[PDB]
Amino acid sequence: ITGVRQIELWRRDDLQHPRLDEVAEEVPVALVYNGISHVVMMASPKDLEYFALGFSLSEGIIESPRDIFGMDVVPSCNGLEVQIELSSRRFMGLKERRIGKPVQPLPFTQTFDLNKLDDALRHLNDFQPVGQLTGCTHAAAWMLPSGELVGGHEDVGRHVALDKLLGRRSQEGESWQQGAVLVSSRASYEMVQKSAMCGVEILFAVSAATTLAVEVAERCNLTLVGFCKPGRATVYTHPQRLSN
Amino acid sequence: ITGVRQIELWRRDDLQHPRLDEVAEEVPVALVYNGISHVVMMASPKDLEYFALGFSLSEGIIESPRDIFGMDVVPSCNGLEVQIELSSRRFMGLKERRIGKPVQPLPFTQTFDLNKLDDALRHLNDFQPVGQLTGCTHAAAWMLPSGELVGGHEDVGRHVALDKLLGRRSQEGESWQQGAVLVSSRASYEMVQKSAMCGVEILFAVSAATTLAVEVAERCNLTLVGFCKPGRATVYTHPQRLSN
Ligand SMILES: Nc1nc2c(ncn2[C@@H]2O[C@H](COP(=O)(O)OP(=O)(O)O)[C@@H](O)[C@H]2O)c(=O)[nH]1
Numbered sequence: 001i002t003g004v005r006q007i008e009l010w011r012r013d014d015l016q017h018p019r020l021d022e023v024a025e026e027v028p029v030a031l032v033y034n035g036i037s038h039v040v041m042m043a044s045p046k047d048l049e050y051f052a053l054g055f056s057l058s059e060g061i062i063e064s065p066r067d068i069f070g071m072d073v074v075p076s077c078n079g080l081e082v083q084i085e086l087s088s089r090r091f092m093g094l095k096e097r098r099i100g101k102p103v104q105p106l107p108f109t110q111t112f113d114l115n116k117l118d119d120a121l122r123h124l125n126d127f128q129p130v131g132q133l134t135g136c137t138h139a140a141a142w143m144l145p146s147g148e149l150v151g152g153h154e155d156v157g158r159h160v161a162l163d164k165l166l167g168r169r170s171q172e173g174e175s176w177q178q179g180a181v182l183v184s185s186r187a188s189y190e191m192v193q194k195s196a197m198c199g200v201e202i203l204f205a206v207s208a209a210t211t212l213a214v215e216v217a218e219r220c221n222l223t224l225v226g227f228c229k230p231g232r233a234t235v236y237t238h239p240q241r242l243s244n
Numbered sequence: 245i246t247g248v249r250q251i252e253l254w255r256r257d258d259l260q261h262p263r264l265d266e267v268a269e270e271v272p273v274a275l276v277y278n279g280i281s282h283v284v285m286m287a288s289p290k291d292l293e294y295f296a297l298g299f300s301l302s303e304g305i306i307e308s309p310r311d312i313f314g315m316d317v318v319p320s321c322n323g324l325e326v327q328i329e330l331s332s333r334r335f336m337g338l339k340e341r342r343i344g345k346p347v348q349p350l351p352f353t354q355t356f357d358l359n360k361l362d363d364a365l366r367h368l369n370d371f372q373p374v375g376q377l378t379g380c381t382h383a384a385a386w387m388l389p390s391g392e393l394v395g396g397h398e399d400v401g402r403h404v405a406l407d408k409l410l411g412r413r414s415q416e417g418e419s420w421q422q423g424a425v426l427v428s429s430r431a432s433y434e435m436v437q438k439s440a441m442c443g444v445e446i447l448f449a450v451s452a453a454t455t456l457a458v459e460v461a462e463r464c465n466l467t468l469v470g471f472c473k474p475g476r477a478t479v480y481t482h483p484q485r486l487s488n
């Protein structure tokens with residue numbers, strides 16, 4: 001199963017007999033826009049096309065996925081590269097800025113009944129096969145106003161995991177939209193910045209948030225909920241969008 | 245209390261009456277070597293001198309803390325900068341490489357009785373005042389062969405937290421050394437790379453590790469233990485150094 005490796009190790013009790021357990025892969029991945037290596041991110045070695053797409057929108061390197069005319073995932077020395085053919089307009093924009101594109105306040109369009117949230121919380125797992133085996137993954141899911149988790153993606157690192165989902169949803173155009181993002185991690189200012197960039201109005205994080213995170217969500221008109229556990233949830237910003 | 249902010253929010257049950265809770269600060273900090281901004285890292289707004297030092301050794305920007313002739317922490321727009329005066333030799337080395345210094349296999353010098361570990365596990369908390377209040381911190385502690393936690397530092401992000409401890413220990417010269425590092429997080433390849441750089445032979449991580457992490461620890465002769473919880477611990481590499 002992709003992302004997982006069977007490794008030899010020792011339990012604290014038996015330093016003389018090695019055992020096997022599954023460990024999660026963490027390959028370095030490089031996003032290469034028109035030959036220029038923009039970033040190397042450690043990632044689970046799957047859903048890289050989605051990651052590449054997601055990351056492009058997230059960081060505001062593109063406005064549309066139509067801004068990309070090619071994507072090939074290639075092996076390298078360290079690990080993997082996603083070779084991305086990019087609009088001259090957007091490439092120059094990236095060269096120039098040398099992310100930081102502007103965020104821009106969100107509209108109020110989305111609603112969410114917090115009663116539908118618990119069920120979604122119990123199903124985040126369904127998108128972490130390696131997390132399940134391994135304990136080393138985070139996931140990011142898209143949840144419709146219904147509460148239904150339409151799809152989701154895991155990763156060794158929470159941001160890459162979010163980027164992948166953002167990429168996913170970027171490709172499910174229309175039928176998705178609406179809804180919210182569910183994330184297994186803590187919510188960091190960059191996570192909310194990315195979400196907002198991609199038109200996400202509500203973000204549910206399973207753990208804590210930072211001062212800066214909530215401050216950013218205020219100026220973005222993004223609705224930030226943290227400590228989302230079955231029976232709990234704490235909203236830091238723009239509660240206007242949620243019901244009981 | 246530094247690092248903490250009292251913020252207004254809403255519990256899932258009461259979207260009409262705001263309450264207060266403590267949230268953790270996440271200021272952007274820039275490490276500025278001789279006027280050149282090398283990195284911006286999000287961090288808890290304390291122990292920045294230690295962070296700056298730690299990070300320098302970690303990344304191999306310096307060999308000794310004697311390589312630094314000045315450190316001033318200054319406020320800015322985003323947040324904070326640590327202005328670092330650096331050896332011409334080491335500065336040029338950093339300019340040139342434009343981390344990646346060589347790691348170099350560790351010697352076998354350290355031992356640890358896993359029986360002394362549980363107690364240390366119960367005391368990691370003692371180094372997260374904001375973690376305690378907030379749930380948003382990670383910590384990195386130095387544990388002597390004794391099992392005694394001599395000191396420790398928390399942060400919003402695990403790496404910065406480790407860097408801070410590495411900085412700390414870099415300043416406790418001699419009396420520390422020996423021992424091991426205890427970390428509240430998952431162990432990532434960069435965490436082990438940093439530790440090794442600073443002469444740490446044993447690393448205890450409270451959570452999972454990645455394929456790459458353990459692979460790196462093999463070539464570094466670093467002893468990597470993960471899933472360290474009271475009564476548990478799982479060693480991925482060089483068990484030679486530990487007893488039962
Ligand atoms: N393969 C494997 N998985 C583990 C082991 N120990 C724990 N896990 C899984 O990984 C997760 C550990 O995450 P942890 O650091 O304990 O955070 P926590 O789950 O919130 O306590 C757990 O949810 C377990 O399902 C282990 O020894 N091997």
Ligand SMILES: Nc1nc2c(ncn2[C@@H]2O[C@H](COP(=O)(O)OP(=O)(O)O)[C@@H](O)[C@H]2O)c(=O)[nH]1
Pocket residue numbers: 206207208227234265266267376377378379380
């Ligand atoms: N200030 C504050 N702290 C919390 C709240 N909920 C949980 N915490 C603390 O933050 C931690 C939450 O981390 P969590 O994401 O649940 O990981 P876990 O502790 O392994 O389950 C807990 O250890 C709590 O001590 C809250 O609503 N407010």
